[PDB]
Amino acid sequence: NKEQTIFDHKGNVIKTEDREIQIISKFEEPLIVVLGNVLSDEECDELIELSKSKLARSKVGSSRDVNDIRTSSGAFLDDNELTAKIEKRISSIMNVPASHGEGLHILNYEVDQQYKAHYDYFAEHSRSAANNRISTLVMYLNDVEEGGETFFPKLNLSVHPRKGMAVYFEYFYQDQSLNELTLHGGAPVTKGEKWIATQWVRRGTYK
Amino acid sequence: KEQTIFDHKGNVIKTEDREIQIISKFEEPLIVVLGNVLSDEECDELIELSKSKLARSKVGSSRDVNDIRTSSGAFLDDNELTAKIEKRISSIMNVPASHGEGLHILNYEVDQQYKAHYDYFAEHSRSAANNRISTLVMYLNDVEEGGETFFPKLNLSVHPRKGMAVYFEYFYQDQSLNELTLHGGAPVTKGEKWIATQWVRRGTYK
Ligand SMILES: O=C(O)CCC(=O)C(=O)O
Ligand SMILES: [Co+2]
Ligand SMILES: [Co+2]
Structure with missing residues (x-):
């Protein structure tokens, strides 16, 4: 008997209020789902541009507080x-109120940059672990000429960047060994560049 | 790690007439989700060809698909x-077209399925002298619900999406790797599913 998952959409599409998302593929335990048509091309481009501080003194996201x-x-x-x-x-996709999300986090990888393998949940006896992260959505905001895979090294599987698509994964299982298998990184970009938006979701209301 | 037939290491496969998208990979055994394999028009025309073919061949017999x-x-x-x-x-599969059996069309209506099976033939069967080594399953339409291609020993499934495909191979020296490519087509629960399949042999098949 498999453990319950937060994401429980049963079909091939997720009908949200303003967009029909495609369910492309999934690994079951832990649950890792590739999603199509999450963002339009225009939304992708705008999220990239919104992330830019443009050498001004104020950092984008400055309206976020010391609790953030x-x-x-x-x-x-x-x-x-x-x-x-x-x-x-x-x-609607992650099946959790938007109040549990940390907010859209934008990251850029220049050529040869990478994100070493890591967990998204915080350390077990950490203070942040009181309202720990339970799931992640990584949205690809551009096409990456080469490299830039989201890879899960303990599961021997990867998702390749594709503009408008996303990879979802959760780590709220009671067998910790399942949460451990969500270890993941971003492979080096070897041609071009990579832009992503990440939504990290908390167990409890965050904002 | 054993070398795979499928050689493509980037995010796209550039064929003569089309840029295929590499969407995701399970490394071992190798299972790859591919985007933009077939245009919408190619999918539509393959289905119309199938209807003619299934009708003219008076095919469509059993309840479910059956290996x-x-x-x-x-x-x-x-x-x-x-x-x-x-x-x-x-070009996608990195095996000459002369090794392929040709475009095999399957249709599933509501409650039809294809129970888990290996595509390759058992050792010592007559087909094992020129056995299948890899499969490409192309989704020719969108399926309201159900119809995923699933791999039960790997807990992995690919959902039908018009124009996309799932590639997998089973030509490993480690036989346990080949046996992990056990796979099926899950019941369609809403709508209908059309696929094309290319099975590729070790040696020439033309
Ligand atoms: O219908 C499916 O998704 C699986 C098809 C299949 O098993 C095959 O053609 O070899
Ligand atoms: Co992460
Ligand atoms: Co098969």
Whole structure:
């Protein structure tokens, strides 16, 4: 008897209020789902541009408080109608209220940059682990000429960037060994560049 | 790790007439989800060809699909379209089109399925002298619900999406790797499922 998952959409599409998302493939335990048609091309481009501080003194996401998680690398977007619209769609996908999301986090990889394998949930006895992360949505905002795979090294599987698509995965299982298998990284970009939006989702209301 | 037939290491496969998208990979045994394999028009035309073929061959017999029997009536007749598609496929699969059996068409209506099976033949069968080594399953339409291609020993499934495909191979020296490619077509629960399949042999098959 498999454990319950947060994501429980049973078909080949997720009908959200403003967009029909395609369920492409999935690995079952832990649950890793490739999703098509998550963002339009225009939404992808706008999220990239919104992430830019453009050498000004104020960092994008400056409207976030000392209770907010702060990202050294990349930027959390400031809330607006677009991010709210997208967070609502993502909430239908991830089956959790948008109030549990940390907000759209944008990251750029230049050529040869990578993200070493890591967990998205916080350390077990950490303080952040009181309202720990339970699931991730990584959205590909552009096409990557070569490289840039999201790889899960303990599962020997990867998802390749494709503009408008996403990879979803969760790690709220009671057998910790399942959460351990969501170890993942971003492979080096070897030609071109890579842009992603990540939604990290908390067990409890976050914002 | 054993070398795979499928050689493509980037995010796209550039064929003569089409740029295929590599969407995701399970490494061992190798299972690859491919985008943009067939245009919408190619999918639509393959289905119309199948309807003619299934009708003219008076095919469509059993309740569910079944790997015991032959299925000659469900291979499309060779024409310009099919040759063009097999040429593309051969660049994807990295095996000459002369090793392919040809575009085999299957249709599933509600509650029909294809129970888990290996595509390759058992050792010492007569077909094992020139055994199948890899499969490409192309989704020719969208399926309201159900109809996933599933691999039960790997807990992995590919959902039908018009124009996409799932590639997998089973030519490993480690027989346990080949046995992990056990796979089936899950019941359609809403709508209907059309696929084309290319099975590729170790040696020439033309
Ligand atoms: O219908 C499916 O998804 C699987 C098809 C299949 O098993 C085959 O053609 O070899
Ligand atoms: Co991560
Ligand atoms: Co099969």
